């Protein structure tokens, strides 16, 4: 049976699983098929994943059953060649929003995520567009990608103070080779009420087993092989399989509302719903978390190490 | 001659060289004074927990009879005594604190007081209230902060405009050529609000200042700085200039920056980081120190920094 | 003659007998044609009455008069088994008030009310959704039914403060038997405009006089007796029915704008007008007072009992 | 050791224990104040009201020379006086009750100010603008309330944030095994809007002592009371802790519970009640006191602690 | 040549003559024609004028030409039996909204005026419903009528404060016998930029000169006289007729940007338009204000009497 | 036993009767003083005007060393010399004449301080900014006005509330039997904000004592006056009261009023205005009494008064 969490602090639940299309007309109806049965009815997508077909293929799959569906989609990237087909302005939020809900066949989206930061256009201005967005009915709620801390605590603080809609939602890199969401964006999602949807959580298939001795760091060979070795020794502890253990890590992690995964078929699917049902323990938690640290960064190191940690404790 | 520069957007001019206590005998510390306000470097930087208060009290005996031709700069809110409220940024502790460090100092008012670091179990509504209560007072000119979260200083800046309330204007911050993380959030951030930075262990706690050659920060890979040294040692044959004045130059060049905190234990010493002044590091020497420096950012900064969000939003170095 | 009273400090004036459907075509048309006719023009329903039937059986009731009654209906319980099919946030208040419009046949509802507090969306985000929905002309005047006292306040203070709708009524259980809505919720009623609409006005039929010697706490026999003595006593002054006893004193209590009752015909509709066109003298209400008084939880004893009453002095 | 908690959301820390004056011989207040200090005991609550001001005189002279040590709580508005204006929370007699506070303390400033009772008289709004004054002049550190409605004090929480105002940090509440009516709606309240519990009468007005076996608060009825002492024992037989230590410790383990006054004419008595830190109730234990002590609760709560509207709005106990 | 006036602080202008229907298709058609010839293009009603046939009169004959109108007209008293056929609450406003658009045939009005102070409904939420009128295009400009000058102060600085449209008409009874308007409301109107719209010019047809020896006091027969007489003297110097003496004194007259006179045909239209180009001097004015002056009320009347005039002196 | 009222909203407090100074010899104004304040009548009323201020010094010399027993209550604004900014409500003359009463009544705060008249020529934000900056220094406790439009002070009252500072409280009015003007705007207005009258002339100038039978005001027409009296005359046989003692007791009747301001030369003067309270009017005596003394009101309220606008605004008298 799928898990539901609360996106963020918005009220508005998710499966704990969500298809990423990050994408045969038969063939995309029998995946959303499959995957509505099995509870993972978060669909996401965006306008540049094929240049828009991703979009459409998915539109027609839901076709049907859109209302059984929450659809999640990503906007904000070059989608043209044209000096205003891109960005977060007004002219192309609108002209986009209004696309996707073209391409992806509905008459609205349950949500809405900039794709990237626009540092060319006022927050306030962004803001006011998604808003109206909102109460024109096209959108019920929105998020962000790929925003620094300041960017995105920025964007909130403008929001409460204009009275608009705020981010209940991150899609965010974060996977056991990618803890970077750890420093900033976990604890103002904590602090703040910005649920994580989290992408490439095998860390682009890096954490499939497959191996062992343009949005991430390359990862140095030696430290994936070490994150390798523990989920190893976990997998012999446990039975379940090294994606299982990355997702079912993921799950535990603060903020963490949904992990999108794909599913090719129904054995895949299969395999990755076996993340749900049962729990890494504190201590196969603990190795796995000791296997995959890194230095953080300044300011968060002093923090990390403990000597700031009595006033200000970081959340994992 | 001294060079000043604007503390971010606050319309406060700092020389770019100061004097940090983080060294300190009142005839002694009187001397260094003398001769650190004869070079115009009349900006100096304590806080209660330099040698438990000792900092502040020596500093305060040293500047008698002249306070009025100084900047002080001090920090609070760090562990100070064993008490439950010894600590933190409570209206309890920020008060007292703030009260005992204008006694230690023998002055009525301090230039520039910040926060030594982020106190998560105080509502920064409260913090940026007292803050302000203690400027209207008359008792502090300016405010800023160390050792924040970009989150958390965007949070404070914003709850200061919305309620009227002095905002941060200096981050002491921890930047050198071989601890640049302060451009992924801090410095834009910066930029982007008018915060500018006084910098602290410039030479990354005396690692850039040719000693070495082939707990605030992340121990550095001998390689790493061994890379970094052999560029300086390029920058310095060019230039005729010592390791730490290129080092201190260096961040002279950098967004935001508005002083650099340096030590001097007397003339000679004071002297050799006076010539960190009066001359640029090249468009190309930067360049080439950076490309030695360089590390690869975290996420979500990464794909900024690599080029492929690039267009949208720039990165500011 | 049927009274009418402002509903709170909305301006909007209620029948002070109002007919909860808390419901044969003709049957339902006649119920509320006999309704009509004594100016009992007040209709009060609920999605979860019936699984949506009892809203569309009076949908089809009012069909040709909908004009002449005000339509007060509540939601936010949980009507279906998905994990979104319950709350107030945006998502299920959108999809649910839509719901309602469709199965009362109509193009807007007179009072929506939340039908309980929703601790998981924040109140700031409902209030924005029902401004939307006001605006949008859907519906006239919000309510609520089962806050706590702190709760209402925290959403009165944040309307004003973000210039949105306030909640006008408050659904609310109050009778002899049952008093609480004494201790928080109608003093704040006073305070901020919130006019109470009362349902249960018997007690759940424990006042009818039929008994003698989910939502509320079960009643001790020996206090119901208690109350019923006196009711009886007022009856034998009076000669009124002790339903009408009960609801005449219901109709002194500060706040209370309309009593919401049962009629399953023309007899029982003109019993419980009776409860209209007399008042309790002074003395029946302090009997009546007296025997159904219970002791009153901290905070609010010391008000009560007379020693923190100068500078704050109770309603009742 | 001294255990100590934030009270409420303030980033103020308190001992877990602190000590009612509501007890109060200079020598022997003084000799009190030593032995509560020693232990760590530093919080001391009194009121206007604790024998017509001699409390407060007294405590202040016990004080005198290390008031620097003690968190002083103190409580106005209650009637203190025959005349129209010598009771409430109006700008008149809050100022001057204050003020006669201070002079009585003999102190420049109090801790925590707490206005004792809901003065509806006055509008909130002013109230808080008064209180702010007062924090502003450096008269009081913090701010707080006892005896609200939960709407009373949501009303003025949210005035407060609105007009950027301090707010109330510290709910003086009455809360016992006994006495569990805080949990209804001020305690959820405290959770929301970060106000902490200081608790006063935690032994039921000495029904929990052992004492008793088989006007703020309704009598209890003997028979619930015998019930509640029933499962004490039984704790009692499995921790070997005194029913008040337990009374204590249960208390401790609620939300929002920042600290427990507690009485103390000597050193042993002190001892005894100090024995309620250092351990906890356990789960199941916490769970067998709470099924002795439960009673109905009111409308509207009835339905959500029943579990019909739980799913959307739980219980915090 | 007909004058135009700014309507208060609005920036919008009116004709300095309007026509009052306070109403033969093809007559009231032809009074309409020759009103646009003269320039006379305010058109002024209220849902009360005879039970809603002015309003639908007046539709009928602007048909064909509304755009050439401004149309102004007035609700909230009370135009039905029902408990909500009258006041300002929302329900109320919107109804008489639409119901005066679909009477008038058209789809806005220029002018929309509370006809009276509704105490009983919030004037943040009357404000409120009026902005959403003006948003959705149903209303260009708002205004009053008998408002108290506190009520109308609070409305504005409610309007101001909330970010919605402010009165910027105040149709106010104004004439030699009623100069009440000069004490609050002008000066009111002058400080906070509402324009008047004045009624009854000639004081209910007493100051036509047939006269010699609800809303407004009775007028005492010596007081009458006496500015007849002056007006009297004023027509033996100008070759005026009273009625053009009484609407020029008007004219003149701070806040004044209207008045609505009445016209059955060319000769009485014509009659009224010779209030125009021409001007009563100084010291007709003052002969005038001096016969037509009565005692100010407390607090007025130490500023009148020069006592405080200093620092706040009197418009007139 | 004095009667006490709350002053509007405020929470404050007030004897029913006040004492105007507008009578006022140190020793003689000491004794009114001490059979004022035996008698419950602590409310003293002035203005920087009554005797170019003379009456602030001796109430001030006739109040001092019990000052605290005292509300005092003063006026200013009005002309008090012959310069330009010897007048008015801007902020020069305010903070200088404020301070100039304080040094006169030999006190550090007044209890009321009224605008005596309303200053067009100053902004409603300037002079409330002023007022807000004295309350929060302690120089006054509550402020009030005196002959403004309803306009004005609405006007004013929204100010102060949008911008978080103090508001009007009292209201000191003209209002008699023969002066109601009161009633239109001024009376629901301070209904509807919170604003209390201070009455002064409440016989109307001498005219309502029973000496007269068959610039502030306007002249009362005699035959106007004659039916009062009549109506006064009737009621002193039912009530066996006097004509001033109905006269202030009519006043207590109506809704705002908080205070009464009489004169009292000596003992028995003032017992003969104290024989206003004690007792009530009847409804029936009120409208005897009320149907007197009616007048026409003006537009716009006369459609309300005559019941053809008062279903949805009714008249609070
Ligand atoms: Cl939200
Ligand atoms: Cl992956
Ligand atoms: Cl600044
Ligand atoms: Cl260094
Ligand atoms: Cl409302
Ligand atoms: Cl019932
Ligand atoms: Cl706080
Ligand atoms: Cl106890
Ligand atoms: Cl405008
Ligand atoms: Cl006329
Ligand atoms: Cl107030
Ligand atoms: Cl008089
Ligand atoms: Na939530
Ligand atoms: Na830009
Ligand atoms: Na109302
Ligand atoms: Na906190
Ligand atoms: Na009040
Ligand atoms: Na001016």
Known sequence: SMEHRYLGNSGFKVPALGFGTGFDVAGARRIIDICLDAGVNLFD?????????SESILGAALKGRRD???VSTKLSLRIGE?????????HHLIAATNAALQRLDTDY???????????????????????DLVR?????????????GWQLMKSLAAADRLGLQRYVANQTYYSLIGRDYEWELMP???????????????????????????????VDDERLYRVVDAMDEVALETGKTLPQ?????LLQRPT?????????????????????????????????????????????????????AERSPVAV
């Not at 949500?111 to 060319?120: E, K, N, R, S």
């Not at 024109?136 to 620094?148: D, E």
């Not at 054995?267 to 719903?273: G, P, V």
């Open 136 to 148: 024109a009915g096209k959108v019920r709620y929105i998020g962000l990608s790929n925003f620094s």
């Open 188 to 218: 103002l999602g904590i602090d703040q009420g910005v649920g994580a949807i989290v992408w490439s959580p095998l860390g682009w298939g890096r954490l499939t087993g497959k191996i062992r001795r343009g949005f991430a760091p390359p």
């Open 256 to 308: 963490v509302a949904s992990v999108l995964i794909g599913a090719r078929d129904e054995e895949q699917l299969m395999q990755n719903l076996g993340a749900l049902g049962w729990q890494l323990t504190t201590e196969q938690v603990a190795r796995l978390d000791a296997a995959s640290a890194v230095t953080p960064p300044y300011p968060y190191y002093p923090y990390w190490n403990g000597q700031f």
């Open 45 to 53: 997508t965006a306008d540049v994943y094929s240049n828009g077909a």
């Open 82 to 90: 044209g000096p205003n087909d891109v960005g977060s302005s007004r």
């Open 109 to 131: 989206i349950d949500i809405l995520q900039l794709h990237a930061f626009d540092a060319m256009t006022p927050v306030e201005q962004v803001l006011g567009t998604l808003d």
């Open 245 to 249: 253990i990355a997702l079912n890590w």
């Open 68 to 70: 059984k569906a929450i």
